[PDB]
Amino acid sequence: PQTATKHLFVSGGVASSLGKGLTASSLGQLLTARGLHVTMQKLDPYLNVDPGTMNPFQHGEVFVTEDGAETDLDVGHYERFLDRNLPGSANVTTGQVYSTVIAKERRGEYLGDTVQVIPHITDEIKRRILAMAQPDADGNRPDVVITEIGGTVGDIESQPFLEAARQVRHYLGREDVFFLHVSLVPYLAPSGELKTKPTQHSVAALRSIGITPDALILRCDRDVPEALKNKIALMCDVDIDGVISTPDAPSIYDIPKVLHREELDAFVVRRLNLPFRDVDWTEWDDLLRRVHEPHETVRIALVGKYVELSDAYLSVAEALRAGGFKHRAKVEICWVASDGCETTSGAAAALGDVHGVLIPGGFGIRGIEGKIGAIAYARARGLPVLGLCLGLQCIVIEAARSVGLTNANSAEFDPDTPDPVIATMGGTMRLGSYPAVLEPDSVVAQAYQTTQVSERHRHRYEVNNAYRDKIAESGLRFSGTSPDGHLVEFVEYPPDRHPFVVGTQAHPELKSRPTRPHPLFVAFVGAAIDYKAGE
Amino acid sequence: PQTATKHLFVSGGVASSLGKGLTASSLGQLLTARGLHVTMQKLDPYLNVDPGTMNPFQHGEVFVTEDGAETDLDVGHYERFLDRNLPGSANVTTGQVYSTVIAKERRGEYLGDTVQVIPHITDEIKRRILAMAQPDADGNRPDVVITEIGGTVGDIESQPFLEAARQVRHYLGREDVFFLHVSLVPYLAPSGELKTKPTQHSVAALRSIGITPDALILRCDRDVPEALKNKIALMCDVDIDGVISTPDAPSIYDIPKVLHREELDAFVVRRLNLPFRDVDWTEWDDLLRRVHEPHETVRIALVGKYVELSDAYLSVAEALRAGGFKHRAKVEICWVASDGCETTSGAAAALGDVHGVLIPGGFGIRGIEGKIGAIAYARARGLPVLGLCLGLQCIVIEAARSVGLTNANSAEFDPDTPDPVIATMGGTMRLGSYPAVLEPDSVVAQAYQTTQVSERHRHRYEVNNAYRDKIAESGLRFSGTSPDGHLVEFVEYPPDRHPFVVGTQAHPELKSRPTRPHPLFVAFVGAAIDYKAGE
Amino acid sequence: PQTATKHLFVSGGVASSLGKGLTASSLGQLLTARGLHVTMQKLDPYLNVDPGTMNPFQHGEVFVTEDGAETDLDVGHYERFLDRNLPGSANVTTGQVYSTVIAKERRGEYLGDTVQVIPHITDEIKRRILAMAQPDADGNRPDVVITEIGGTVGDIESQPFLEAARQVRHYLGREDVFFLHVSLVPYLAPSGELKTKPTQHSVAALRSIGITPDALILRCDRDVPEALKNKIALMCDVDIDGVISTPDAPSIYDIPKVLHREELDAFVVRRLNLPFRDVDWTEWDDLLRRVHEPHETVRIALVGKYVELSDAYLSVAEALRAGGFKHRAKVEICWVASDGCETTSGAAAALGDVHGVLIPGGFGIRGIEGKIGAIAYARARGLPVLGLCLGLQCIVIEAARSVGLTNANSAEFDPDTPDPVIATMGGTMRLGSYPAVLEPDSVVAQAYQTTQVSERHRHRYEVNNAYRDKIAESGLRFSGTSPDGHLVEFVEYPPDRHPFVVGTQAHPELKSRPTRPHPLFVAFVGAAIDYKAGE
Ligand SMILES: O=c1ccn([C@@H]2O[C@H](COP(=O)(O)OP(=O)(O)OP(=O)(O)O)[C@@H](O)[C@H]2O)c(=O)[nH]1
Ligand SMILES: O=c1ccn([C@@H]2O[C@H](COP(=O)(O)OP(=O)(O)OP(=O)(O)O)[C@@H](O)[C@H]2O)c(=O)[nH]1
Ligand SMILES: O=c1ccn([C@@H]2O[C@H](COP(=O)(O)OP(=O)(O)OP(=O)(O)O)[C@@H](O)[C@H]2O)c(=O)[nH]1
Ligand SMILES: O=c1ccn([C@@H]2O[C@H](COP(=O)(O)OP(=O)(O)OP(=O)(O)O)[C@@H](O)[C@H]2O)c(=O)[nH]1
Ligand SMILES: O=c1ccn([C@@H]2O[C@H](COP(=O)(O)OP(=O)(O)OP(=O)(O)O)[C@@H](O)[C@H]2O)c(=O)[nH]1
Ligand SMILES: O=c1ccn([C@@H]2O[C@H](COP(=O)(O)OP(=O)(O)OP(=O)(O)O)[C@@H](O)[C@H]2O)c(=O)[nH]1
């Protein structure tokens, strides 16, 4: 029989930006490779109910789950390292917790009580942590739930989360709950020494709020010597086997090997009394060979509205690299500001030396003339094109304009357009997984190797069906639709006209994993390798 | 010219229930008696947006301000000690702050930002503290704003409030901001010693979150000796003149004298560089003579739905005592459960030895047959009656039933009544101050000594005007109405039928002060003294 | 009239090794250059009563003051940056404080009291801090006492010192006491960001023990941007003018310019209400030109017993560089292990490419055959030699052996020597300043430009006077003695035999300053420049 679901909390000390999320994901990968059913959850101390109101060009992309929740980009790291679909419950924010509790209070659901941080707010957080241990849709209960606590220990914002995690430990006991604390071991260049004092003080602050760490992640720019690990084991009263030297890794994919060398995952398995099995390194060693030993390089333009923050297109960038890994190729991303591609000379200067053009999503942006300009250039140049959501819409708009509908546009970007080739169906916001049926022998069906697929959506604008016959005059095919045929889901040009020009209303990058590249990104990068070889 | 408005923060350490609110109010009284314009504010760390969802029979009454806000009962203590009307802004809750910030976030008012505890929550609290320093309706800016911080220092719930108060100090400087910290000095009976260690540790916790106390309130069951005050001055680094021995007082009205003997108010005035003037003791010494030296006693029944928690009727109980003070009388409150007054024998057992019957408000209660039974008994017995809100409604229902409308009731308590003598005008919830016009020479006009008054309301049910002629058959007079005459505001019987049976739709107790008794409570207690003398 | 002596406490947070001592010294230099009388003191939390029991080859040199106290090497940094003689009271250790208090307790001096950390230990520390504000021998009372608190805030070992400093502030008031806190602002290379969180948490720990910092030293590997300084000013509630970006400097002599650019010294002067005067940069700008713009280079061997820790010979190394500065020369120190110089081929390999040989002191070492070997090589080679304490003794031993006393030695290193040319006078340990009278026209009198000098000693072995005539057969002159002529203080060879071979029983390096090079080191480096030019 399966033992109780274990809870492993990941907290951070000293300072943020130490990479707690990627350490947690890498531990999730190691435990998954040991045959454990691992799920992950992020507690975000921000008040935004969902990250949809945040500027993604400052704060990073919005990740969308199968069930349609808009979440912190960390859920994307979890899905990529676990190769698993996570529920919307995998991202809890202070905003969610407080508005749920306040809304219940206003309805009289606390029956005359004074509604308090303890127990009402901490009960809500605890409820959301414990919900992760419920059996999934297939009927499976996880072995381990890894919960990452955002914010830094000693700060005000994470106090209700840390209190809830302390109560989870109190109610489930030490056998079912593990605390992993991430700290910084700074190097002082004038004296040449590494310092353990910040970890010593951070662990005392963690202990002061009632939490005893079982293990410590020592984030450092170099190996932490055994003498320093011994000092930390003694001063922080942590088993020496739980004191983990975690030096900065060359790639994010190398972090599981760093943690495994320090035997963190074997310590976790023994401490939580989990079924023991050796790590099966087959899948991850294969990824690492594709990461560190590519056989060729290919340049891809990512034509984003704003490209100074790569995290705004993190899942797209990861899906492009994963497409490369499948071909044993290194994808070099050429970050191109879409505003520079509006004119033919601007698009030529920006895209003249690339091998493929990716037009990503642009939820909430204004001004798409640069994205349309990039597609017009790529079509004339013979460059492969992959359009995602706004990308498909731009492929459809450019096709309509190429056949005489000069002022064709989306009613989203030009409400006064005489030809709204993209329009609402107010309409309906489509979030999360939606099924699509593909034309057999189409470019998209050949890429997927099936005619029945599902992809995640985040949009309310659709191809206007009144324009299908007029748009098709360009040779553009509506090669994928909703099962009833009403909604256009995929577009493509015939391969005799353009070897690879594909659009999707969805975000296939979200279902990409470094160990499981998405079929559309594999076909796109493959077409980019073909273009390079032809040139 | 008037100097900058000063902010005086009152925090609590060691444990709650030490009486921070009454200490703050008493300091507000002392500063007011020095001719300073003082306003007060309570920061409540509970999530209830307003205390309307709290059971008042567990948590205490809801106070209503002139502008119609439903607030914590502490605002009532502030109004009573300051003799001033406070704005709805005088009560800030965590619930208010978080729902305001989350609602702004959902509307996109933070323009793409990550919404955080610091600065977004603390900016909202700071905004609400600084709003208290704005000029009032008459154009006057306060000299001092006393802000009471609910919760205890070292607890999670008060951390955003304490951080906001620390930022107020940072931005206004030490000259305009004063920190008063309330602590416990426990007595250990086996060793016979008072202990300063809890104050020492509480002040270190206060300092740890960035606040330096200017003065300390040492709450104790006896005088704190000079040697202990010297130890605290040294260990807490507080001026000895700011170390205040605050032993438990015999009455709440004695606390200003306790603080004045220790010269706390003179220390505050000097430390904040406020205009100096001696306390004018005329008004408070007069109150203390009425408190400690009554010339007679009078027994009043307070016929409440639930009477085990006196704080559920705090403003009523204070208004009854203030009515007594005006007559140099001691009002002994006989707390009577209304459910025991439904039958004539039950009402006789409960009210047979009282001199007056007060029927208070009952916002949100169910089952008023006991309150109607108490009025029927009091009318037959010749007992004075004062009804407040639900009290007037019960006087009107009992009058209607005494003239043949056997099933007369409020549609609130019996929706199926064939005679809804009390009904909505859904209707309109009337909150805060409303003007009333009184019949000249009526009992109510003679009590007020004017025909034009205003009182605070908290109700949506009104006297049904279709029943005025039928109800008047009992001899009941509609002696007070809204200015247009549409809404019944006051009822009374003629003095030749009952010497004092008065109802009001409002809560006059809220406008009562111990130094300014409300005219209706003065007339009611006076009628109770008359009944006692006649018996 | 002179205002009250000010106390400026320097504490450290986050981690040790940030350079608190050199920051404090540099501030002492800036205040001295403003015409203020500044004195400095180090509080060391170690239990060693004096650093004499510490291995200097692990922990650094022992500094000796004029009054003969053996102190932490930090006193040497203070003397060098202030150009002032400090009393033995300038170094307080936990060992000193506890043994003084325990010794008084054992004698019954606390008259029946329970002897406690507070107040008995903290009174002793406070006494030692306040003693620094007493008028000196010349009758002058300092303007400022800078007290450096060793250990890190949040650690156990510095708690009594920090408590004493908090009591100094309590008793003298905020006008006479200033707190400077040194913190670390680490850089995280993967994200490219500087982090203020460790300073935020360190200042909260400092505040928690009752201390409010007036200013912060932000130790960093680069400039701290204004946005981070603004964040720290707000979160730590420190005046923005007191938030000091202190990036790692190229030389220790550049730190005053770093602090002056951030206007720390002008902030200190204004905050403590000290007489204001601009920094006179004449002397320090002159030093910086000699530091950064040398006209030539000269190589000097420092023939130490153990040379892997340069701090074991810090004052010697600084005196050598200061000798270089006087000649506008860069002294390159060739760290030579003395054990490798015992044989003529070993000494040739080690000293063949140098321009001068310095034989430093060796209090407590064993095995001096390598130092004697280095002197024998340097004499034959024509290399300049400067011997300090053990160095003079080695010059005397080598001279005695060169004239037939083959087994000549010190009774310290060979008790069985038939010729103890160096011996005790048990004897008398000579510590601190001793006067010497110099032979007019001798090498040493020409270097000093006077025949009457004083130097600091740390030794009990002396030249055995029974051997003066025999040693003089080598041509060695006893060119300096005690005033009564009994003790040999200086030795030298005639310039016609060796241009510069000088020994001193004292430690002249201790009286060296970078702005005031010692005459013997100036003459030694000058002789090394002469040797280089001749080669
Ligand atoms: O264990 C780790 C984690 C992270 N990293 C390195 O740090 C980089 C940043 O890692 P993250 O993307 O996880 O940083 P973050 O700002 O989200 O950190 P938190 O506040 O969540 O703690 C990564 O891209 C990688 O280069 C490591 O080398 N090792
Ligand atoms: O909680 C503690 C830990 C240590 N100490 C004291 O710290 C002193 C050593 O001071 P360090 O700064 O060298 O600390 P560390 O070695 O523990 O840490 P890192 O260098 O790795 O940053 C020792 O003299 C010990 O008494 C405390 O006083 N309290
Ligand atoms: O300074 C004071 C305050 C209070 N008291 C006595 O304490 C009683 C309770 O005083 P409170 O009604 O103010 O208690 P509380 O529970 O609201 O306390 P906080 O959490 O707000 O701190 C009062 O009725 C009076 O008897 C004093 O004697 N002196
Ligand atoms: O660490 C904590 C514990 C509790 N609380 C908050 O304390 C509030 C209750 O405040 P109390 O003063 O009543 O505390 P208590 O019941 O825990 O202790 P005693 O009366 O027995 O002295 C609750 O509203 C809860 O949110 C914190 O904010 N932080
Ligand atoms: O303000 C400063 C102080 C120091 N330093 C640089 O740091 C080096 C080490 O400076 P220290 O010799 O003062 O380090 P430390 O180990 O004694 O530190 P504490 O525990 O006393 O705090 C110095 O030689 C210089 O290179 C700076 O650049 N700036
Ligand atoms: O005491 C505090 C300070 C700040 N915060 C919270 O810290 C969050 C920002 O988290 P950071 O890690 O970015 O902190 P910082 O900007 O203050 O410091 P550095 O990056 O310079 O190291 C904000 O969301 C704020 O609510 C606390 O909760 N408590």
Ligand SMILES: [Mg+2]
């Ligand atoms: Mg992260």
Ligand SMILES: [Mg+2]
């Ligand atoms: Mg150390």
Ligand SMILES: [Mg+2]
């Ligand atoms: Mg209270």
Ligand SMILES: [Mg+2]
């Ligand atoms: Mg005691």
Ligand SMILES: [Mg+2]
């Ligand atoms: Mg130092």
Ligand SMILES: [Mg+2]
């Ligand atoms: Mg930050």
